[PDB]
Request: fold
Amino acid sequence: VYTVIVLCGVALAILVGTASSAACIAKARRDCLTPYALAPNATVPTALAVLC
Amino acid sequence: KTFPIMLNGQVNGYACVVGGRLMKPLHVEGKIDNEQLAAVKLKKASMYDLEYGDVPQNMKSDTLQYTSDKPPGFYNWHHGAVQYENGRFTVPRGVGGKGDSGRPILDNRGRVVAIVLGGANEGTRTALSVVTWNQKGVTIRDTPEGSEPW
Amino acid sequence: KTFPIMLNGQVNGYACVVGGRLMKPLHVEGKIDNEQLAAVKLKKASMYDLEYGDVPQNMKSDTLQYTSDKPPGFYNWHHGAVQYENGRFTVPRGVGGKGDSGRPILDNRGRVVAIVLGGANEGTRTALSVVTWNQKGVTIRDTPEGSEPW
Amino acid sequence: KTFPIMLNGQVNGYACVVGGRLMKPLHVEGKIDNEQLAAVKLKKASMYDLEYGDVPQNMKSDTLQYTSDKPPGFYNWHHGAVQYENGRFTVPRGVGGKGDSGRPILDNRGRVVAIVLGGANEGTRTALSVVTWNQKGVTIRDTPEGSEPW
Reply:
C-alpha cells in the first residue's frame, strides 16, 4: 500500500513539474516576442537565435 | 482605414489596420463593423493593451504604413491636432473622451505613428497615452499618471 | 419614429415607442430592426393586445409626452387622414390594406393618442380597431364585432 | 439581371434565376447575398454542372425566359459579343476569368440563349464552356477538350 502511493506521488510530481515549467517558460517566451516589427526586421536577432 | 468597435448603439473605440494586419484595445468590447476581420481568431497581449491578428490577402494594400520619424512640429489628428513634446503627445482641452480608443494620428506624409489608450491633464493642456515605435523598431508605451482607460 | 419589422424579405408589422415604453402587436411576429431595441425583453400582456417593455435610456430624447383628450376635428395619417365621428375612428373605402397595424395616428399638433390594430367593413366606410386612452389612463379598445386584424 | 455569390467578401460567380426557377453552377460554391431565396432545401443535379431549386411566389414575372432560338449571328454579352458559328461559341483572347462563373449571354430581343460555365483556350480564339438548350429540349453540352471551367 505504501509503495503505490509513493510511486504515484513521484510520478505525478515529475509530470506536474514538467507541466508547470512548460507553462512558465511558455508565458515567459510569449511575452517576449510581442515586439513584432512589421516594417523593421526581427528586433535583435539574439532572440530568434535562441529560438530558431 | 477606419473600423469601429461599438456596443449596443454607443461609441467605444475605433480600430485600424497597420502595415499588414490589425489591432484593437482590450478595454473595448462588442460589435466591430465587418464580418471579414471579425471571423479571424485574435491573439491578445496584455502588456501592451493591444491584441494582434493577421488579416488575409483581401486586405493586401488598403492598410496604412507606419514610421517612427517624429521631429518637433504639428501633425494632424482625427479630432484636431497634436504636439510633439519630447515623446509626450497631447490633446487640446476637453477634446477627446469616451469612445475614442484606437484612434490613430497621421503625419504630413501619410504615415501613422500613435495609437491611443486614454488621457490625463497636467496644467494648461491635456496629455494623452501613446503606443508608438522607436528608431530601433520596438514598441513603447508612454502612459501619464492617472490615465484611466477611455 | 416608426421602426419596421424584418420578415423574410418583407415587413409583417411595425413598432413605435411612447413615454419611455415600447409597443408590439400580438398578431405581429418577427425580429425588430435596431440593436438596442431587440435586446430588451417583453413583459407581455397578450390578451390586451400589446407587448410592452422598457426602452434604453439613450432613447430618452425620442419619445413623446401626452394628454388624453380627443376633440372633434380631423386626424392626419400616413395614407391621408382619418376622421373623427361617433367618438370612433373609421378609415374610408379602399384605403387601408395589410401590415399597417402597429403604426400610429397623429393630429395637427403632433401627438399620438391612438394606434391601429384591425378593420371591419360595412358598406363604404371601414371601422378599424383602435387602442386609445382614458382620462384615467387605462387602455381602451373600440372593437367592432366581426373585426379583422391586418 | 442575375444575383452574385459572395465567398469571403468578393465575387465568385452569378446565380441565374432564369426560365421560371433558380439555377446556379456546381463549379463554384458559396452562398447568396439575398435572404428570401436561400431559406429552403435546394436539390442538386451533378450530371451536367447545374443546380435546380424553386423560387418564392414573387419571381415568376420578372424572371427572364429562355427560348432555344438559334439563328447564326452576333449576339451580345457583358464582356464582348459572343456568336454562334459552326456549332461553337467563341470570344477573342484576353477575356474573362475566375469570378465570371455563370454569367449568361443574351440576344437582340432581350432573353437568354445560353449560360456560360467557363473553359480555356486552345487555338487562335477562345472557346467557352456553356450549357445550352436545343430544339428537342436537350441540354446538350458543348465544351472542347482541355478546358477547365471558370
In short: The interface with chain A takes residues 18-21, 45-48, 52, 65-67, 133, 136-139 of chain B (CB under 8 Å). The longest strand of chain B covers residues 10-18. The radius of gyration of chain B is 15 Å. Chain B is about 0% helix and 40% strand.
